[model samples]
Target chain A: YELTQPPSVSVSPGQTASITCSGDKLGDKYACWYQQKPGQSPVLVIYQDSKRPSGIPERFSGSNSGNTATLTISGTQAMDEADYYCQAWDSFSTFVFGTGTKVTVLGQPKAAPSVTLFPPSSEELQANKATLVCLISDFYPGAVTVAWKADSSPVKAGVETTTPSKQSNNKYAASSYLSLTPEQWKSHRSYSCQVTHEGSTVEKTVAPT
Target chain B: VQLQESGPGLVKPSETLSLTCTVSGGSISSYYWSWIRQPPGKGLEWIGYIYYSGSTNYNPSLKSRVTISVDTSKNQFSLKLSSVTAADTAVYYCASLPRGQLVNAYFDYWGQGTLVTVSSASTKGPSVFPLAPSSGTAALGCLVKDYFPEPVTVSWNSGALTSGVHTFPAVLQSSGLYSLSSVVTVPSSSLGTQTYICNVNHKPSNTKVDKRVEPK
Candidate 1:
């Protein structure tokens, strides 16, 4: 049967991280560890309860006591995020892998983004089409989700978001664009852009001209 | 789906251990090949594997030394593990992985086995290239590797003066993450005080990383 392991573990960089595996037969068989990230295969990090393979980093170490085996990362990094499986021998092809532990590195410097909505172009409004621009800026570790609304209704169609680009001072900048016919622009009194960054949400609204 | 391993039966210490698994009764496509090893005590060590398209996974602990590759021309795949000792001596089996589900999937076909003795005995990181410190119309490279889900992009900051930019596809790596590489062709003469920010856009998390460097 598969060895037992926690579903996930999170840690900050430079902090020590530990994941444990348990099996009734784990004591006799040497418990081992494998790190398998998404879209990749299982990588053997620790084999036979603590010995590293030829080129494993020094920060990763393994230790075992009684019926449990543990894999320790003395200093974790963002790259340390992966699923870890600690397995041992019971049969050659028997249930070898553990339940698997997801190791995620926390403490990525997070900064909320600045949200500003620009009204559709006056010339475009004069014409038959309009484009709304939502400017996002000054975000660290760049992930941001933006939603657009025409007054109370959410906007989905004809919206395009640019990839975040780094700025001169080392922050990030991104923009989401919404395409609309002037009829729709005139139909709504105001449009809003809501940007979600980390634990915070910032939204901005622009009144139609 | 018959698998048969063929390689050196014995390997010297501190040398490279090489082997190949020949497949019969099937084309070497749409399937995965896993190279597994076991010592006398029978601790199954999955060295790594290669997909049907010649794409491969990294052997986690053996990252620096082991290589798994595919050769569909001969209907066989290969494994090369370097710098060995007696510790690497084990019965190496080649198993076939079909259907692309990497974890908790069945490997239906297997090689009877082949034992290669001796040897003896491997990161997750994006790499920056142009390491020779040479000068010319050289370019800077930001190689993003060993990360998951293929939605990553490479961008240059406003200050990066360049001629051409090229970003390679995110190839699925041995560690199960997609690795991508990008380059900006800049004149070498402008490098004295020019700092270039290699902006990497991680689309999956909608985040970015800025790598600043003055190639002086």
Candidate 2:
């Protein structure tokens, strides 16, 4: 798999907007990424020639390392990704991606919360309400909700809550609640909690008994 | 490999087209899914995208909260949006871009086709099967959630859910594997989750398997 990043970069004439592409298999073949404009056809912006096309602004350039490559467009324009690409020779044959990364050249770049849920440890629910918290941190000012399920059945009603934590990377933080029986947790490995923000939803699931 | 969209046709003039692209040509364990598009006179517009890990970017001009996902097993990727407009037209595409830490990115490969038109469509019309979404079992989301190898993202959708309010609960696990449960959250008097679906997309593979999102 390949991973890349292009967070709406800005650059001066001689400066550079670095476009990074990372992948699993690193070989000797020539890896490349392309750039497509809003209209017209996809053009070869970065290749073995790392330098921009002839008439292409000298502002764009690219470089490669062990298993990754970086394309830096010195003079960032408003018309990038519109699309871009990072290709490299690897494993058997052909080019691939780490993860598609897009470039936004306008407006305030909003950071979506990077949510992560820990593995649901076997919790013995001795009480009526067994709380399994799906920590959604690093998020901005937004609201979150949690729901529960047991044996693939709705275990508890949906609930919403929030808390302020400056330490979390994404900034926002919260925990979901589910009221269930001790027996429910063991048999229900299907417990799930979803964190939704700005229309994007990321969820976590627990194993069933 | 296959590609798919998760948003609606009429995008309410200035809304977002929340869709997904799944790749199937190979394994996505080390790949990325790109959200690319083409406008009125453009050949292709590379909308910002997400890594298999859920990392993402948006065209600075359209950056609100656009997200893209990669599913290897099903050979596909997914796309999501925040606020959108008519300008976000053209056929959106996702391919195995590139991977690693220092590589550039682009969509060299592609899925069949699925389009999202921006408009103010309020009538939650029939939930058409737009496309296969991908070409696998089409039931991996619920299956993985049932197996429980690890906490993953799962989604649910009613196979027959043509209209009304529908909700899919997507569970993202620690291993990054997605196990989902989709729910059509409508009034009890409504058709319920009968017409919903739950699709599981794995990275690299770019394949997706969707099954009935049965209420559990």
Candidate 3:
């Protein structure tokens, strides 16, 4: 089977992004949808014909008609800017993927956000209990991620990340809370807040003074 | 031959980035496939390539970290990048490279690239410092440290010195940041008191740091 997708498409946030995959030898067969971002892996957006995998947003949907398949993304957000691909299974065991479609959610680009680390006060440090805050601000495209690390190890629990909320100026702001013990903080080790969004990764590192 | 890349649009920092390239119209065991990427508004970066026999070669900068594996039975090749940061963000493209020109490579067929970003961000600019010359000559050493969200650029300038500057690739730190160093050499007679300057430019913030030093 041969599948074809548009090279690229652009849309504003809150609008619908539609991608069509035309194929030969694809008559009423099972078609799947995939969403891929640069540097990351492809996620199964739609599987088993039209069903979304667990944890996928409802706004994404898929359908098949005639010799073609379509993937529709409704209410697209800045975070929705990515590449979409459709795959169809042939009568044989093999599958064919569309050339790929780049979905660009247009927005006014802004400068990278400034990050700060606010460690717990000396008294809190003395108590061996402290919470550090990672503040991210002034970034456009209200979609960002916040990650925490302690001396190169991933911090899984006791970490909280906030959604990128829109500010009055239309830029975005977000924060992450890293909970730590004074022993962990007072050690010669380091703590870091990794902020990612708009294809940029920025970090703020703090060590107990 | 046809190739398409499939993957997620969003990934958490320090998480792994994975993708699969489904090949069609031909046997995947007959040729070579590669993954290339370009950040939004940035230049292209060659991630790596894999042969049908499962042999692979990755960018030296990413060789120790990423994986490129092939499944001949499935007619597909897969990519996995670990400890991803925002600097890892970009539009990823998969293509077929000719075996004959594998050494001097170019993508003959390409899939429309997909954009991926870390989706979370907090960052600081680089701190620049001057290091003692190791060559005992009129060479200048500059080091930039603690820079986040990499792809930093380094340059050297000295009056009438050699135009070429030797800069090393940005090295990722244990803390998920980056450190870079650049050096330049001048004639020892010309190094008497003239100052040498090194500049580190960070992309995300369009910020720059300049460190100036004179021979001891």
Candidate 4:
């Protein structure tokens, strides 16, 4: 038995969000629903089809119709933006979960990351090598890609970019490191770290002092 | 292949709950190794799971303390839940999310489950109940009580709760805890087929509670 879910869903705050889990094997089993935010575990939002666990809000509800189960987030709110999955007991009594659906709250304030490059400390450079760091901070909806360029040429051999990690202020921060020999640092006129987030790129450049 | 859970059957409060599930029939690759639990007399709770490559997902309620890991060499996976309390007591099971063609997901396998106990919640955490008048009218209400540390965020289901939702101030009870009362107004028709719900987020204890009503 199998079930299917959409890749993603978008809804405005105050709008109703509906996600469908289609599977011929849903049969008579109770369809369960779960919500998972980034960096968190999936919480059961709806269980046994429409029965909800205590402490879950009423807005998150579930139901089943023939070969499909449904999870409805009524009057979706900002906190409702999350990944949702549906689960059901399939044939062989084995349970199956939906592929997964990411919910996005539309029209939330979007912030672009600020990029700053910090060169290796004087003492570290004296040791004969250098590591340049590109600090990317204050971004919202944290999907970002970091690239390194040396004198405008793409450099990948010594670049290490991290996935966006959540910051104290509820925003996101990331760092990309570009390692180089001290001589290579002075060899390049400029080394740049480019961060692309929220559809825009911000680059910070550094050069030998 | 069958599964079996081997771990501490008894744990003390504030200690870690550790258990390992062994996959007896084949390589533990391809499918997600997972942990699930249920308190005595309560429903099943999904604790989270780990893919063979090491990526993991856990329930948020226990996220801060739950860890699932794989030992591919041994064809096994493990679970570690720290800072236990009575509320964490449950019969824990080892399971799987088989990679599926149509939907090879959720928990499919089982381990007969093992029981463990500890003991608790904060300011007793937030307990919610429907105070909606059974046979009530166009309005639905909920009472949130026995919580601590001052404030809580309240929400009403949107489609019908988006508008007309009201959350009164938290009443600082003499018991040194906080209590809340909230209500939402929807058309009478909305009550028949709609599930009117109240969601309470008690941040102080990092707990969320929900209540729903469908009155005539």
DockQ, all models: 0.01, 0.03, 0.02, 0.02
TM-score of chain B of each: 0.52, 0.46, 0.53, 0.52
Error of 2 at B27 (Å): 1.0
Candidate 3 residues lying further than 4 Å off, grouped into runs, are A109-209, B1-216
Local error of candidate 4 at residue B158 (angstroms): 41
Residue-level lDDT tens digits of model 2 in B1-216: 344444433455645566765454455655666566654333344556566566765555455556655555565566667666556656665555556733533344554344455544332211112111111112111223322221123344523443332222334344332233222234433233335455544322233556543222
lDDT of 1 by residue, A134-188 (tens): 6676688678888899888898787766666554334566766676898888887
User: What's the residue-level lDDT of B195 in candidate 4?
Assistant: 68
Best to worst by DockQ, what's the order? 2, 4, 3, 1
- The weakest ten consecutive residues by lDDT in model 2 chain A span A118-127
Clash count per candidate: 16, 143, 27, 18
**Docking quality tier of model 2:** incorrect
lDDT per residue, candidate 3, B10-103, as tens digits? 6678889988878886555446788877666534446678887667777666767889988878878788889887688787888775656433
Question: Which candidate should be chosen as best, given TM-score against the real structure?
Answer: 4
Candidate 3, residues A7-79, lDDT tens digits: the string is: 8888988988878888764545667777766444556687645678677988988777887778888898876
Each model's lDDT: 0.65, 0.47, 0.67, 0.68
lDDT for each residue of candidate 2 in A1-209, tens digit (9 for 90 to 100): 33455534444333446767766533344556576443223555665626454446666777777766777765565445336655553443333433435564433244566443322222223223233445555465545555545546665453333343332122334444343455555655577766667677776676643
Query: Residue B178 in candidate 1 has what lDDT?
Result: 47
Report the lDDT tens digits of candidate 4 across residue range A143-202. 998888989899968665555655445566666656578888888899888898857989
